[PDB]
Amino acid sequence: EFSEDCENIFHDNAYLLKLDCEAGRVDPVEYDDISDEEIYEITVDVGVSSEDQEKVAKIIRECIAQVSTQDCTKFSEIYDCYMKKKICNYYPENM
């Protein structure tokens, strides 16, 4: 699908964070929320439409809020929410 690149990138980040979290490099409780600046940076700054930003924005916040898991598996669970919500359909094919 058209979506594989976005998906792979989110997949990669999740996995990296997981590995780092395992390594005791990251703390899963800092991932309990997210700023508007981070959001812009992973939406518009990378090809999400201005018009669509809030729509992606909502999925990210819902997902983050929905994941009350606070171990290293949080990173992977959040990614699961993002795929479940089809977040990648809002991004361009190449990125």
Author numbering: 1 to 95
From the paper:
Immunization with DNA plasmid coding for the salivary protein SALO (formerly known as LJM19) was shown to protect hamsters against the fatal outcome of visceral leishmaniasis and this protection was correlated with the induction of a Th1 cellular immune response. Recently, a combination vaccine comprised of recombinant salivary protein SALO and a genetically modified Leishmania donovani resulted in a strong protection against visceral leishmaniasis, further suggesting SALO as an important component for a visceral leishmaniasis vaccine. In this study we present the production and crystal structure of SALO genetically engineered in yeast as part of efforts to develop it as a recombinant vaccine for leishmaniasis. SALO is ~80% helical, has no appreciable structural similarities to any human protein, and has limited structural similarity in the C-terminus to members of insect odorant binding proteins.
Recombinant SALO was expressed as a soluble secreted protein using Pichia pastoris, rSALO(P), with yields of 1g/L and >99% purity as assessed by SEC-MALS and SDS-PAGE. The structure of rSALO(P) was solved by S-SAD at Cu-Kalpha to 1.94 Å and refined to Rfactor 17%. SALO has three predicted human CD4+ T cell epitopes on surface exposed helices. Unlike its native counterpart, rSALO(P) does not inhibit the classical pathway of complement; however, antibodies to rSALO(P) inhibit the anti-complement activity of sand fly salivary gland homogenate. Immunization with rSALO(P) produces a delayed type hypersensitivity response in C57BL/6 mice, suggesting rSALO(P) lacked anti-complement activity but retained its immunogenicity.
